[PDB]
């Protein structure tokens, strides 16, 4: 309804002027309740120099349920899987109406940065995160270089 639309004005607004990261992020043509964004890899992480895109879809009882966001880029991240679905606690359990759009993005981009290896969507990219970090980080940036360039 309409408190949402409002509140989702409110947040474009607030993005274009501060945006989080290295992210973009906005209406896909008129529709504003479809998002497109945009995150650079982070600097001295293995996604570094890649683009990665993801689509937002917001409820109609935003801002009090989470958006739903989903990588369209591949990945290689523990708590990334092949559809590009994101496990992220406050994307979920912990969404709360305080949240943006923006702060959305930034937790993205520090899962990215630091992964949840405990809460395993793909069980062995967790596994080696864990186990071998310098082998996770090498894939994690060959597939940087597959996908995200």
Same mark, same amino acid.
Request: proline content about 10%; glycine content about 4%.
């Given at each position: !309804?309409?408190? #949402?639309?409002?509140?989702? &004005?409110?947040?474009?607004?607030?993005?274009?002027?501060?945006?989080?990261?290295?992210? /973009?992020? !906005?209406?896909? !043509?008129?529709?504003?309740?479809?998002?497109? #964004?945009?995150?650079? !890899?982070?600097? =001295? /992480?293995?996604?570094?120099? +890649?683009?990665?895109?993801?689509?937002? &879809?917001?409820?109609?009882?935003?801002?009090?349920?989470?958006?739903?966001?989903?990588?369209?880029?591949?990945?290689?991240?523990?708590?990334?899987? /092949?559809? +590009?679905?994101?496990?992220?606690?406050?994307?979920?359990?912990?969404? /709360?109406?305080?949240?943006?759009?923006?702060?959305?993005?930034?937790?993205?981009?520090?899962?990215?940065?630091?992964?949840?290896? =405990?809460?395993?969507?793909?069980?062995?990219?967790?596994?080696?995160?864990?186990?071998?970090?310098?082998?996770?980080?090498?894939?994690?940036?060959?597939?940087?270089?597959?996908?995200?360039?």
């Amino acid at each position: !309804g309409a408190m #949402a639309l409002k509140r989702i &004005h409110k947040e474009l607004n607030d993005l274009a002027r501060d945006p989080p990261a290295q992210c /973009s992020a !906005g209406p896909v !043509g008129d529709d504003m309740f479809h998002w497109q #964004a945009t995150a650079m !890899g982070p600097n =001295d /992480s293995p996604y570094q120099g +890649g683009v990665f895109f993801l689509t937002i &879809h917001f409820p109609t009882d935003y801002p009090f349920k989470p958006p739903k966001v989903a990588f369209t880029t591949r990945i290689y991240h523990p708590n990334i899987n /092949s559809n +590009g679905s994101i496990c992220l606690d406050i994307l979920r359990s912990q969404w /709360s109406p305080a949240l943006t759009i923006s702060k959305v993005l930034l937790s993205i981009c520090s899962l990215l940065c630091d992964p949840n290896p =405990d809460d395993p969507l793909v069980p062995e990219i967790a596994r080696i995160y864990k186990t071998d970090r310098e082998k996770y980080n090498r894939i994690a940036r060959e597939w940087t270089q597959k996908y995200a360039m």
